[PDB]
Amino acid sequence: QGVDPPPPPGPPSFTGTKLVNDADHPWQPLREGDIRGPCPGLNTLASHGYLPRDGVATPAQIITATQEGFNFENNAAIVATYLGHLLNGNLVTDLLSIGGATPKTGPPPPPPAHAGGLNVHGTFEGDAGMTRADEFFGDNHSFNQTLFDKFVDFSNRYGGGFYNLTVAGELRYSRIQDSIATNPEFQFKNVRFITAYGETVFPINLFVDGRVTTDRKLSMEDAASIFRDMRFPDDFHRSAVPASNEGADQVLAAHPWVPGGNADNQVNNYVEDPDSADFTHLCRLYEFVVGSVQELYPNPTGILRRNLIKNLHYWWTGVNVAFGGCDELFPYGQL
Ligand SMILES: *[C@@H]1O[C@H](CO)[C@@H](O[C@@H]2O[C@H](CO)[C@@H](O[C@@H]3O[C@H](CO[C@H]4O[C@H](CO[C@H]5O[C@H](CO)[C@@H](O)[C@H](O)[C@@H]5O)[C@@H](O)[C@H](O[C@H]5O[C@H](CO)[C@@H](O)[C@H](O)[C@@H]5O)[C@@H]4O)[C@@H](O)[C@H](O[C@H]4O[C@H](CO)[C@@H](O)[C@H](O)[C@@H]4O)[C@@H]3O)[C@H](O)[C@H]2NC(C)=O)[C@H](O)[C@H]1NC(C)=O
Ligand SMILES: *[C@@H]1O[C@H](CO)[C@@H](O[C@@H]2O[C@H](CO)[C@@H](O[C@@H]3O[C@H](CO[C@H]4O[C@H](CO)[C@@H](O)[C@H](O)[C@@H]4O)[C@@H](O)[C@H](O[C@H]4O[C@H](CO)[C@@H](O)[C@H](O)[C@@H]4O)[C@@H]3O)[C@H](O)[C@H]2NC(C)=O)[C@H](O)[C@H]1NC(C)=O
Numbered sequence: 640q641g642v643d644p645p646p647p648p649g650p651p652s653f654t655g656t657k658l659v660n661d662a663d664h665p666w667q668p669l670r671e672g673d674i675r676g677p678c679p680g681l682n683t684l685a686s687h688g689y690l691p692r693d694g695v696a697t698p699a700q701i702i703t704a705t706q707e708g709f710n711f712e713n714n715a716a717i718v719a720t721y722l723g724h725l726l727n728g729n730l731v732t733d734l735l736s737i738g739g740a741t742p743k744t745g746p747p748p749p750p751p752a753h754a755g756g757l758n759v760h761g762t763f764e765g766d767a768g769m770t771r772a773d774e775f776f777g778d779n780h781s782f783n784q785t786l787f788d789k790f791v792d793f794s795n796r797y798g799g800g801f802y803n804l805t806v807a808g809e810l811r812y813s814r815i816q817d818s819i820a821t822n823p824e825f826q827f828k829n830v831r832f833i834t835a836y837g838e839t840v841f842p843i844n845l846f847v848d849g850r851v852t853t854d855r856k857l858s859m860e861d862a863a864s865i866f867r868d869m870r871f872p873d874d875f876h877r878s879a880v881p882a883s884n885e886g887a888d889q890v891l892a893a894h895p896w897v898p899g900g901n902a903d904n905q906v907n908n909y910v911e912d913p914d915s916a917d918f919t920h921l922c923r924l925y926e927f928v929v930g931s932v933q934e935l936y937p938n939p940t941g942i943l944r945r946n947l948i949k950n951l952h953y954w955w956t957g958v959n960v961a962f963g964g965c966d967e968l969f970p971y972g973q974l
């Protein structure tokens with residue numbers, strides 16, 4: 640009772656700004672069974688009906704929604720979506736939960752695979768987020784007001800009351816320090832190291848109304864609306880261009896940092912990891928995930944094997960462009 644996975648959707652026909660908070664996409668409250676998770680973007684899209692409102696969707700639905708709702712760039716959408724799906728989705732039913740585990744993704748895969756959703760900590764979701772607390776403290780998915788207060792503080796201190804690139808640079812480093820000091824299991828390597836810098840600029844490039852073209856900066860009201868209430872600002876117009884992680888290099892430059900983590904279940908004991916992916920060694924990330932998938936799926940056969948092969952190729956198509964050329968791996972051979 641499986642599905643044949645379609646290739647990834649391409650870019651939208653129209654790539655300009657438009658009203659996305661419109662009559663066909665109203666904010667609605669959560670009903671019982673509806674799933675939300677650590678991504679404010681996907682949360683908002685589900686709560687406006689760009690995604691299924693229950694928070695379970697196909698990879699193709701996620702790509703279309705991120706493009707339609709926010710003008711997320713096509714390749715960035717492919718890289719993030721199939722990463723999330725390979726690690727956390729059900730490859731047979733072609734369904735991914737944007738939060739925790741649910742029967743809505745269908746019959747479970749064979750362990751060690753889990754199809755447990757974007758909430759699963761360790762390989763995609765990780766530490767030193769802006770509005771979510773590290774998993775060590777007990778909840779890696781819920782909005783956290785204490786962290787949002789720090790968001791506001793840093794915006795007051797560095798951005799005249801608004802979130803801009805200067806704020807992003809300072810906040811990213813401070814949050815890393817918070818975790819070093821307080822989380823003995825703190826990890827900041829591989830996937831998390833790369834995705835964390837991109838996440839800090841998404842509020843600027845995607846959450847700021849697209850009619851704003853000079854001095855792009857996010858108000859705390861708009862930040863609260865998306866990060867906490869999963870709601871587009873009134874009359875929200877998406878980015879006038881497809882966009883992703885522009886400026887992430889500047890965030891790293893403001894406080895140069897190396898992948899690693901706290902060693903030996905001890906705080907204030909951050910050790911570099913020289914084998915981790917970084918921004919000049921991106922193909923390492925590709926290989927780490929192919930390997931993680933091999934751990935989840937040690938001996939797949941049948942429809943599962945087929946869908947794995949397809950989804951792996953789909954992910955490579957995005958990664959190849961985004962990382963500037965990586966040799967494709969074939970852990971389960973070819974079709
Ligand atoms: C995110 O948000 C933040 C917040 O909104 C934003 O910050 C702004 O960033 C810009 C720069 O990008 C800031 O503007 C710059 O300010 C520099 C520092 O200003 C001080 O020093 C000036 C130079 O000193 C001379 O004069 C003093 C005596 O006053 C003397 O001791 C020195 O020896 C020296 O001779 C000084 O002129 C300036 O005072 C003026 O401005 C203040 C207000 O800031 C005003 O109260 C004064 O009356 C007076 O008008 C101040 O004391 C400054 O050096 C710098 O100038 C360069 O650039 C301009 C053009 O941009 C050139 O004309 C000039 O020749 C220099 O090359 C520039 O003006 C701005 O102040 C920040 N705003 C805030 C609120 O912090 C970030 O940019 C945002 N980040 C992103 C990524 O967007
Ligand atoms: C919302 O998110 C926040 C931020 O993550 C959560 O709050 C944190 O909760 C943890 C767990 O209780 C706190 O951890 C402890 O912090 C000590 C350091 O405190 C200093 O620094 C912080 C900021 O960096 C200041 O707030 C604080 O006043 C101090 O100046 C550590 O020394 C503690 O270590 C002990 O426990 C660990 C774990 O068992 C051991 O490994 C250590 O050896 C040691 O015994 C500890 O880590 C943390 O301080 C909190 N941070 C903040 C900023 O408040 C919220 O719980 C979360 N939920 C909510 C409330 O919405």
Ligand code: HEM
Pocket residue numbers: 677678679680681701705709711715716717719720723757763764765766767768769770771838839841842845846
């Ligand atoms: C394309 C598919 C997407 C996937 C699979 C995805 C997945 C994730 C995951 C798993 C996290 C949590 C990582 C963490 O902080 O621990 C996350 C965080 C985040 N995502 Fe997404 N995301 C996607 C698209 C988007 C889009 C389009 C935006 C913006 C419009 C966005 C904005 C964010 C932001 C800002 C965070 C950080 C939240 C915080 O630190 O408080 N994402 N995403």
Ligand SMILES: [Mg+2]
Pocket residue numbers: 677764765766767768771772773779
């Ligand atoms: Mg996190």
